[PDB]
């Protein structure tokens, strides 16, 4: 019964606007949620999955989030995101294929700036797999 308006958005397009009695994210400090009538708030969201629950738990929609920020606006709460995926589409076979294929090329790459991008990419792939498991 007690619900508030949620909105997920990225540079490309807006994703959704559903009602929710509870919302689940992941922060760099630790896991965080949001209840109705929550006070204005803004914080960065670390690489990790998010989950949205409808009022009187109709459904529990599960997604992924590589990076972004949370925003609370007196009533409505928006989810600024960089990359977003629904959990179902995150198939293991598609992602894992790329993991070992990039590892060999990490050896050949000389420059450190280019290595850090591959060092950052390996985090993303594993995180997608980690989210899908649990």
């Amino acid at each position: 019964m007690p619900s508030f308006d949620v909105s997920v958005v990225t540079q490309v397009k807006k994703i959704l606007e559903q009602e929710a009695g509870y919302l689940r994210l992941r922060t760099s400090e630790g896991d965080i949620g949001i209840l109705p009538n929550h006070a204005p708030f803004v914080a960065e969201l670390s690489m990790g999955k998010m989950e949205i629950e409808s009022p009187n738990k109709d459904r529990r929609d599960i997604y992924f989030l590589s990076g972004g920020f949370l925003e609370i606006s007196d009533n409505q709460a928006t989810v600024i995101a960089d990359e977003v995926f629904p959990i179902e589409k995150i198939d293991v076979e598609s992602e894992q294929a790329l993991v070992e294929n990039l590892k060999k090329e990490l050896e050949k790459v000389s420059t450190e700036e280019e290595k850090r991008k591959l060092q950052k990419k390996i985090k993303i792939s594993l995180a997608k797999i980690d989210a899908k498991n649990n």
Binding site: V12, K13, P40, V42, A43, E44, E71, I80
Partner: protein, 225 residues
């Protein structure tokens, strides 16, 4: 003189006609495609500007090297956007003559340019400006978001005081009929017209969220452009 000549020219122009007519319709659909993609980025922009708006109102009195000038004016960067193909009219004509104004009208002679397209890279070669790296024959399917990784290089060089200012020259699509050429500053943040009294709280303070917001706002501005 002869009708054997005339009969050729009719067939010549009539073939040209059927393609220029085809290019009209193919272009008609493509701008409507990109006019949606640009408007679909507004929800992100609205949510983005609201955060930075509050930061401006709070740190207005004191002042910040983003909202106001650094006073150093030691170095400047520029971003130019032109088409790969031609037959545009006076579209690339206007853009390349507008950056000419910015390049000329500066206290500092030292400026670097980042061109997007073919008509830019060809132009920069002749005019002899400081030769940077370029990106042409851009893939839209390979989302321009990814192609806009130039955002990373310019924010890093602001942190090192390598650039103290940044400009972008693009053609803002207003309507189907008319487009307005524009020149905006990116790195010198534009303080909002209306001041914001909405009251935020930050987990890693104001210091860190702004540091993380800038890379994403730059990529947005380039992507929108």
């Amino acid at each position: 003189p002869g009708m054997k000549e005339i009969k050729s020219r009719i067939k010549s122009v009539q073939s040209t006609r059927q393609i220029t007519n085809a290019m009209e319709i193919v272009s008609t659909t493509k701008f409507k495609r990109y006019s949606k993609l640009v408007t679909e980025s507004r929800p992100y922009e609205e949510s983005m500007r609201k955060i930075l708006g509050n930061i401006a109102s709070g740190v207005k009195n004191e002042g910040h090297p983003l909202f106001d000038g650094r006073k150093e004016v030691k170095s400047i960067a520029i971003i130019v956007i032109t088409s790969d193909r031609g037959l545009c009219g006076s579209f690339n004509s206007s853009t390349l003559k507008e950056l000419e104004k910015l390049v000329e009208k500066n206290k500092n002679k030292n400026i670097t340019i980042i061109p997007f397209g073919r008509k830019a890279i060809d132009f920069i070669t002749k005019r002899n400006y400081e030769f940077s790296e370029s990106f042409s024959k851009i893939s839209p399917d390979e989302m321009n978001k990814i192609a806009g990784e130039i955002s990373e290089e310019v924010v890093e060089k602001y942190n090192n005081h390598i650039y103290d200012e940044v400009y972008v020259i693009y053609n803002k699509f207003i309507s189907a009929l008319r487009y307005d050429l524009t020149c905006e500053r990116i790195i010198p943040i534009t303080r909002p017209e209306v001041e914001l009294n909405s009251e935020y709280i930050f987990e890693p303070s104001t210091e860190y969220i702004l540091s993380a917001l800038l890379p994403r706002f730059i990529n947005l501005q380039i992507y929108q452009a």
